[PDB]
Design an enzyme around this catalytic site. Structure first.
Site, short mmCIF file in Angstrom:
data_model
loop_
_atom_site.label_atom_id
_atom_site.label_comp_id
_atom_site.label_asym_id
_atom_site.label_seq_id
_atom_site.Cartn_x
_atom_site.Cartn_y
_atom_site.Cartn_z
N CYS B 149 -7.50 -23.25 14.09
CA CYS B 149 -7.34 -21.97 13.68
C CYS B 149 -8.69 -21.28 13.67
N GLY B 153 -8.46 -20.90 17.71
CA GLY B 153 -7.09 -20.33 17.41
C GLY B 153 -6.91 -18.95 16.81
N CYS B 154 -6.35 -18.67 15.71
CA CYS B 154 -6.09 -17.58 15.01
C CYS B 154 -7.29 -16.62 14.78
N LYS B 157 -9.06 -15.38 18.12
CA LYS B 157 -8.12 -14.83 19.07
C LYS B 157 -7.81 -13.38 18.46
N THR B 252 -4.16 -34.39 11.26
CA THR B 252 -5.35 -34.51 12.57
C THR B 252 -4.77 -33.30 13.65
N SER B 290 4.08 -18.99 26.60
CA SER B 290 3.93 -19.22 25.05
C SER B 290 3.19 -17.89 24.41
N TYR B 291 3.02 -17.90 23.26
CA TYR B 291 2.56 -17.06 22.40
C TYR B 291 0.85 -17.10 22.74
N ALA B 293 -0.41 -18.11 25.92
CA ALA B 293 -0.51 -17.51 27.01
C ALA B 293 -0.53 -16.16 27.21
N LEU B 294 0.44 -15.43 26.42
CA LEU B 294 0.67 -13.97 26.58
C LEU B 294 -0.34 -13.40 25.84
N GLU B 295 -0.68 -13.63 24.36
CA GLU B 295 -1.56 -12.87 23.77
C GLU B 295 -3.28 -13.24 24.34
N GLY B 318 12.46 -19.66 22.24
CA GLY B 318 12.52 -20.24 20.93
C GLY B 318 12.59 -18.93 20.16
N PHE B 319 12.05 -17.79 20.53
CA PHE B 319 12.13 -16.27 19.73
C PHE B 319 13.38 -15.70 20.55
N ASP B 428 0.47 -29.85 11.41
CA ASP B 428 0.97 -29.61 12.76
C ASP B 428 2.09 -30.97 13.17
N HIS B 566 6.00 7.38 3.68
CA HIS B 566 6.06 8.56 4.78
C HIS B 566 4.60 9.05 4.95
N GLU B 571 8.43 2.34 7.39
CA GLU B 571 9.48 3.20 6.54
C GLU B 571 10.84 3.35 7.18
C1 LIG Z 1 -4.80 -20.20 20.35
C2 LIG Z 1 -4.01 -20.47 19.13
C3 LIG Z 1 -3.81 -19.35 18.17
C4 LIG Z 1 -3.05 -19.38 17.08
N1 LIG Z 1 -2.97 -18.55 16.14
C5 LIG Z 1 -2.40 -18.76 15.27
C6 LIG Z 1 -2.04 -17.32 14.27
O1 LIG Z 1 -2.24 -16.47 14.37
N2 LIG Z 1 -1.38 -18.15 12.91
C7 LIG Z 1 -1.13 -19.29 12.58
O2 LIG Z 1 -0.64 -19.18 11.46
N3 LIG Z 1 -1.32 -20.21 13.51
C8 LIG Z 1 -1.96 -20.03 14.60
N4 LIG Z 1 -2.17 -21.06 15.34
C9 LIG Z 1 -1.79 -22.41 14.80
C10 LIG Z 1 -2.81 -23.13 13.82
O3 LIG Z 1 -4.09 -23.20 14.46
C11 LIG Z 1 -2.15 -24.36 13.25
O4 LIG Z 1 -0.83 -24.08 12.93
C12 LIG Z 1 -3.02 -24.95 12.25
O5 LIG Z 1 -4.48 -25.16 12.98
C13 LIG Z 1 -2.40 -26.16 11.53
O6 LIG Z 1 -3.67 -27.07 10.92
P1 LIG Z 1 -3.67 -28.52 10.91
O7 LIG Z 1 -4.39 -28.81 9.49
O8 LIG Z 1 -2.25 -28.95 10.95
O9 LIG Z 1 -4.39 -28.88 12.27
P2 LIG Z 1 -5.87 -28.54 12.54
O10 LIG Z 1 -6.46 -27.55 12.02
O11 LIG Z 1 -5.96 -28.67 14.35
O12 LIG Z 1 -6.75 -29.72 11.96
C14 LIG Z 1 -6.90 -31.15 12.70
C15 LIG Z 1 -8.35 -31.41 12.79
O13 LIG Z 1 -8.37 -32.83 12.54
C16 LIG Z 1 -9.47 -33.30 13.79
N5 LIG Z 1 -8.95 -34.75 14.04
C17 LIG Z 1 -8.22 -34.95 14.89
N6 LIG Z 1 -8.20 -36.32 15.00
C18 LIG Z 1 -9.02 -36.94 13.84
C19 LIG Z 1 -9.22 -38.08 13.88
N7 LIG Z 1 -9.12 -39.41 14.44
N8 LIG Z 1 -10.34 -38.20 12.85
C20 LIG Z 1 -10.76 -37.14 12.24
N9 LIG Z 1 -10.70 -35.94 12.72
C21 LIG Z 1 -9.53 -35.72 13.66
C22 LIG Z 1 -9.11 -32.18 14.73
O14 LIG Z 1 -10.44 -31.97 15.48
C23 LIG Z 1 -9.30 -30.92 13.74
O15 LIG Z 1 -10.50 -30.75 13.22
C24 LIG Z 1 -2.61 -21.02 16.66
C25 LIG Z 1 -3.03 -21.95 17.49
C26 LIG Z 1 -3.69 -21.82 18.88
C27 LIG Z 1 -3.88 -22.97 19.75
C1 LIG Z 2 -0.78 18.90 1.59
C2 LIG Z 2 0.39 18.02 1.42
C3 LIG Z 2 0.48 16.65 1.95
C4 LIG Z 2 1.82 15.98 1.60
N1 LIG Z 2 1.66 14.66 2.02
C5 LIG Z 2 2.93 13.91 1.59
C6 LIG Z 2 2.94 12.58 2.27
O1 LIG Z 2 2.09 12.05 2.94
N2 LIG Z 2 3.84 12.03 2.00
C7 LIG Z 2 5.09 12.59 1.16
O2 LIG Z 2 6.20 11.93 1.00
N3 LIG Z 2 5.07 13.70 0.68
C8 LIG Z 2 3.91 14.56 0.93
N4 LIG Z 2 3.86 15.85 0.55
C9 LIG Z 2 5.03 16.21 -0.16
C10 LIG Z 2 6.10 16.73 0.63
O3 LIG Z 2 5.66 17.88 1.33
C11 LIG Z 2 7.20 17.17 -0.46
O4 LIG Z 2 7.59 16.25 -1.42
C12 LIG Z 2 8.43 17.78 0.45
O5 LIG Z 2 8.00 18.80 1.42
C13 LIG Z 2 9.41 18.46 -0.60
O6 LIG Z 2 10.55 18.83 0.19
P1 LIG Z 2 11.52 19.87 -0.40
O7 LIG Z 2 12.71 20.01 0.60
O8 LIG Z 2 11.99 19.97 -1.77
O9 LIG Z 2 10.67 21.30 -0.14
P2 LIG Z 2 10.03 21.94 1.12
O10 LIG Z 2 9.85 20.96 2.21
O11 LIG Z 2 8.74 22.72 0.61
O12 LIG Z 2 11.01 23.07 1.57
C14 LIG Z 2 11.14 24.15 0.98
C15 LIG Z 2 11.42 25.23 2.06
O13 LIG Z 2 12.39 26.46 1.69
C16 LIG Z 2 11.77 27.52 2.02
N5 LIG Z 2 12.07 28.45 0.93
C17 LIG Z 2 11.24 28.84 -0.16
N6 LIG Z 2 12.01 30.02 -0.81
C18 LIG Z 2 12.97 30.18 -0.03
C19 LIG Z 2 13.74 31.28 -0.30
N7 LIG Z 2 13.95 32.17 -1.56
N8 LIG Z 2 14.92 31.14 0.54
C20 LIG Z 2 14.86 30.55 1.60
N9 LIG Z 2 13.95 29.59 2.05
C21 LIG Z 2 13.13 29.49 1.15
C22 LIG Z 2 10.14 27.23 2.10
O14 LIG Z 2 9.58 28.20 2.78
C23 LIG Z 2 10.35 25.91 2.86
O15 LIG Z 2 10.40 26.12 4.06
C24 LIG Z 2 2.73 16.45 0.90
C25 LIG Z 2 2.69 18.04 0.32
C26 LIG Z 2 1.31 18.69 0.48
C27 LIG Z 2 1.36 20.00 -0.06
#
Ligand SMILES: Cc1cc2nc3c(=O)[nH]c(=O)nc-3n(C[C@H](O)[C@H](O)[C@H](O)COP(=O)(O)OP(=O)(O)OC[C@H]3O[C@@H](n4cnc5c(N)ncnc54)[C@H](O)[C@@H]3O)c2cc1C
Ligand SMILES: Cc1cc2nc3c(=O)[nH]c(=O)nc-3n(C[C@H](O)[C@H](O)[C@H](O)COP(=O)(O)OP(=O)(O)OC[C@H]3O[C@@H](n4cnc5c(N)ncnc54)[C@H](O)[C@@H]3O)c2cc1C
Ligand SMILES: Cc1ccc(CNC[C@@H](C)O)s1
Lengths: 588, 588
Positions: B149, B153-154, B157, B252, B290-291, B293-295, B318-319, B428, B566, B571
């Site tokens: 890794c 590996g990870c 990559k 190993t 495999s992953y 190859a594609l990654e 497998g997936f 492994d 949101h 969500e």
């Molecule tokens: C391209 C690639 C991408 C991957 N991406 C991910 C990912 O995103 N997420 C994830 O969870 N996993 C990922 N994996 C898998 C991950 O690398 C393995 O699951 C992880 O390395 C397992 O660790 P390990 O200790 O079992 O083996 P290793 O980490 O390979 O450890 C074995 C070690 O022992 C050594 N060794 C071998 N024989 C001997 C010996 N006789 N004496 C002494 N030392 C020896 C080896 O050289 C090596 O250093 C990826 C693998 C590859 C190939």
């Molecule tokens: C700058 C900003 C950023 C925000 N960012 C987030 C965020 O990232 N995530 C999040 O979850 N929330 C966020 N909020 C809060 C979110 O907008 C509110 O929780 C949500 O809009 C409330 O919904 P509501 O239906 O109660 O009221 P509103 O969405 O305000 O609806 C009320 C509507 O009724 C209308 N109205 C008012 N009086 C009357 C009337 N007498 N007759 C007819 N229509 C009327 C109003 O003009 C409006 O159109 C943010 C708010 C602000 C100000």
């Protein structure tokens, strides 16, 4: 018993059909209703715990106990034969439409919550109308259907946040081997606003189409509840009229506050104007310290702007304060300046905003610090982010009888019902509920199911996760640390924490120990996770999944037995071990 | 029951102390042991669920029933007075190093699991040596301590993956307002390889320092198990010697396979060579599906490279295949060419690799499709990703007694023990375990505690989450869809799904309905989530948190009752409603 469930359901529903899955008689009635373009809810009794009792209580209305029965607005219509006698006599349409009111549901407010509730309501045959109006800002800004999130909130700030994140992408690209030179690249504010407003326009229009194609009446008018079934609307031509509905849902949101100081309303703006402003704000003063004020100062800096924030006391009041200060310390190290412990006194206009050539004015801000030292600096724009509030006087006549708490917010029971019995409130104006767009959508959809389809599901308002979209994002779910200690006491609270570094930040030569996360757990409850906190990239995507585990009552043991995905930032949560009490350093 | 646990702990631990927090006599002994730099495990009897029995059962060894009691390698050393008398007389050091073997533990393999294991055991007084040797590749590539890794590996990559994503960020920056023009920027391969190798080198050094600081002997030698307690080591000089150990852990790993065709070993390469290649691969043929190859094909394409992939049958065998197919469709739509249902016959050399000017060779590849049609094409580089394998021949002498399954991986009980009672295997080479870096680490740490600190906790291998870091990433947790149907039957399996579009893709004009997620559930087990699947950006950050909830038996209702954050991609898992049996479309 089961009886009063069935009385509430039958009394409230518009068109509802008690049915069987296996009964061929019921199935022929359904296809009649489909061909008749008649929408309705359908309570299939053979897949409910005590469907046998419900058929018995159906006789309390219909003197029969077989299946199917159709009801329209409290009234028993008939059995199988009776309804097709209406169909081939063409009396069906008249009887399904007839109703004491004009609508089954009027929704005041066309935002995140109201539009969610109306679209789910018309699904089950409720004749629905939805009202939306946008009172203009003091300088006259205006926008279309969708609410605050869609036009002046979550949508356009995360897009402007994204334009700011992209500046670090251009910096990082060089170290990963790309030929470009970040020093030779500037940002263009107008091109951005045009693309952001284009996506908002698509959302505006798409909502009108969703309503059109669901049989919901859209009225671009300002409604006002004068009596418990009566709403008084005002046209674009100031024309006033009165519609009536059976059930009423209040969902009109909040709007920005200004401080009571001279110059403020005349010369400054708020978030409502910032997202469609036609010029770059220039040198900007942001007054306030909530997520709005930090998020905006956040991207304004990242786009090369000269930004100052003026903080009365603390950042992000009500959030975990260790994280608040970590958020703020990041922005200060990356461009945002802060004037700490300072408050504004007035705004003087030195130069008028130049509409013609498309340029800001020039303002003079007069302030003073807590000790008493005086503030005075010139700024081209001044944005106010000092809170939001409802204004229910414009919406709700005192005499109708809806109780408002001391903030102007609506006191509801845990099923969203006002003091008046047929009126409900959802969204920002429901008192003491989290003010978030996903919350307002859930309350709205789960209420409509309860009114017109006999549902029981309630909205759960606890442990709702958040994310603050500052230059470094901060996602959170659960209690803050200080709050957990205060509720259970320092001895019973154990905190696991640790710094981290994104793999992506290694080649790019970024900081080693700014990204931080912590689990606040309770000792005497199998180390239950009380709150979760993370500061780093994609904090929203990181936090979400754990919101499910935390609703399920996760513990530190559950995090330890789950394996990480490598290499991610999020996997650091699966192997946390340093405790705060232990005093060991959490650096990498 | 308690009986055989205590006997197992005392017999395998190196230095262990039985104690209680409240006692001042044990605090006295701890303080003396800490002073003399004597590392030991420590049970705290007043913290265990049945310390009254563990205390009473200790008398079978010490002929005494009190606390504290110190053991060294199965032998009772003394109570409080007896220990200080050894200390005050200069005898305590020699007793605690008195051992039948050279080391308490010998780890063969210095990769993810083995490094994790030796460091954890050292921390409980176990005298530890770890061995690591990097067998060079056919063209002689070699690297530093850390494992697969860390070096090939990870880690390298995801850094090259990240260079690839940044090309889309340079694209999208234009539409958010930045001046730059993507069309006039190029990518320099060697600069990126320099930055990546530089970070790998700092991990190489950190792992040396970490083994120093825990007093772990680090031998850069090749080990070989000749008897249950005898390891044969071979120097960089070829200096052969033998060391002994009480416990042996095999760790190993694996190495890349080559197809048996002419020109493969002579003129092709594998991922072991790609991550430090001095020249850009150029026009490249990737042989595999495999992953790996594609990654690799993925980022190589995003760097300007002309890339082709030769698929024997299906992708990501497998997936979940619907997911795999969608992963492949995206790559084909963004550069990568695919030669479907194709296999190679021989590699011929037209040009030798030019060290001088630092440019690749040139090759001719001949093959055939599954219908006899011919394949013939030139490439500059040919990368083989046709799987990996251990070679336990090279490390495990046939006569020791360690049993291998039909693939050559060690057969272990669910506590990592082999057929020989004192030899263990992790990572492994452990048969039927998911081959991932986090799994190896957890196995190695949890084992070391059971061996040298009385621990009992096993490693859980079920439902381990994964992310495939292709251009569009794909993260998953639990069964594939076909697998769930295969085990329960179509009738009992319900699938909820939906497309989505990241908000960041709106202004940037990317695809509407490419991103996809689904939940596979069991109708008869309360709609338990059996598998989670998502395709889109940050899929690793998205998935990780959900792994915890699946580990606690999350159901659909649990996802429904949790509120979304949101605006995020993640969500969308909280509002899924369309089902596959429903036949409704999952577009937006
Ligand atoms: C391209 C690639 C991408 C991957 N991406 C991910 C990912 O995103 N997420 C994830 O969870 N996993 C990922 N994996 C898998 C991950 O690398 C393995 O699951 C992880 O390395 C397992 O660790 P390990 O200790 O079992 O083996 P290793 O980490 O390979 O450890 C074995 C070690 O022992 C050594 N060794 C071998 N024989 C001997 C010996 N006789 N004496 C002494 N030392 C020896 C080896 O050289 C090596 O250093 C990826 C693998 C590859 C190939
Ligand atoms: C700058 C900003 C950023 C925000 N960012 C987030 C965020 O990232 N995530 C999040 O979850 N929330 C966020 N909020 C809060 C979110 O907008 C509110 O929780 C949500 O809009 C409330 O919904 P509501 O239906 O109660 O009221 P509103 O969405 O305000 O609806 C009320 C509507 O009724 C209308 N109205 C008012 N009086 C009357 C009337 N007498 N007759 C007819 N229509 C009327 C109003 O003009 C409006 O159109 C943010 C708010 C602000 C100000
Ligand atoms: C080897 C491959 C299997 C599937 C691939 C992409 N889908 C192509 C289909 C729409 O024809 S590539």
């Amino acid at each position: 018993g089961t009886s009063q469930w069935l009385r509430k359901t039958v009394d409230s529903a518009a068109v509802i059909l008690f049915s069987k899955t296996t009964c061929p008689y019921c199935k022929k009635v359904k296809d009649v209703l489909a061909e008749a373009k008649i929408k309705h809810a359908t309570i299939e009794l053979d897949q409910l715990s005590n469907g046998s009792a419900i058929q018995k209580c159906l006789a309390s209305f219909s003197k029969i106990e077989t299946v199917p029965q159709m009801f329209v607005r409290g009234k028993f219509i008939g059995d199988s034969q009776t309804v097709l006698k209406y169909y081939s006599n063409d009396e069906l349409a008249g009887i399904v439409n007839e109703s004491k009111y004009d609508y089954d549901l009027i929704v005041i407010g066309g935002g995140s919550g109201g539009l969610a509730a109306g679209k789910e309501a018309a699904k089950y045959g409720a004749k629905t109308a939805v009202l939306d109006y946008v009172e203009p800002t003091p300088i006259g800004t205006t926008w279309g259907l969708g609410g605050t999130c869609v036009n002046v909130g979550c949508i356009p700030k995360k897009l402007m946040h994204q334009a700011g994140l992209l500046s670090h992408a251009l910096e990082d690209a060089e170290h990963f081997g790309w030929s470009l030179d970040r020093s030779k690249i500037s940002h263009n504010w107008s091109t951005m606003v045009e693309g952001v407003q284009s996506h908002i326009g698509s959302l505006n229009w798409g909502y009108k189409v969703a309503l059109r194609d669901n049989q919901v009446t859209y009225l671009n008018a300002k409604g006002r509840l004068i009596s418990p079934h009566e709403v008084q609307i005002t046209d674009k031509n100031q024309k006033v009229s009165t519609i009536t509905g059976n059930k009423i849902i209040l969902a009109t949101g909040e709007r920005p506050k200004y401080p009571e100081i001279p110059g403020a309303v005349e010369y400054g703006i708020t978030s409502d104007d910032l997202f469609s402003l036609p010029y770059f704000p220039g040198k900007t003063l942001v007054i306030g310290a909530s997520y709005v004020a930090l998020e905006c100062a956040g991207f304004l800096a990242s786009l090369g702007g000269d930004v100052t924030v003026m903080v009365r006391s603390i950042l992000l009041r009500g959030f975990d304060q260790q994280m608040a200060e970590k958020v703020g310390d990041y922005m200060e190290n990356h461009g945002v300046k802060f004037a700490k412990l300072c408050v504004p006194d007035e705004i003087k206009q030195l130069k008028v905003v130049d509409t013609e050539n498309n340029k800001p004015g020039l303002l003079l801000v007069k302030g003073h610090y807590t000790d008493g030292k005086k503030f005075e600096e010139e700024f081209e724009t001044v944005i106010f982010a000092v809170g939001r509030e409802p204004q229910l006087s414009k919406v709700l006549c005192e005499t109708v009888g809806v109780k408002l708490d001391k903030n102007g917010r609506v006191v509801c029971t845990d099923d969203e019902q006002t003091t008046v019995s047929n009126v409900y409130a959802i969204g920002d104006i429901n008192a003491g509920k989290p003010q978030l767009t996903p919350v307002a959508i859930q309350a709205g959809r789960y209420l409509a199911r309860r009114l017109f389809a006999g549902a029981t599901e309630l909205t759960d308002y606890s442990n709702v996760a958040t994310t603050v979209f500052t230059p470094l994002e901060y996602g959170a779910c659960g209690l803050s640390e200080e709050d957990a200690i205060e509720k259970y006491g320092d001895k019973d609270i154990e905190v696991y924490h640790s710094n981290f570094k994104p793999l992506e930040w290694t080649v790019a030569h970024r900081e080693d120990n700014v990204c931080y996360m912590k689990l606040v757990c309770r000792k005497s409850d199998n180390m239950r996770v009380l709150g979760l906190h993370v500061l780093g990239p994609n904090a929203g995507e990181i936090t979400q999944g754990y919101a499910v585990a935390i609703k399920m009552g996760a513990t530190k043991a559950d995090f330890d037995r789950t394996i990480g995905i490598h290499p991610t930032c999020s996997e650091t949560f699966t192997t946390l071990h340093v405790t705060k009490k232990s005093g060991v350093s959490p650096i990498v």
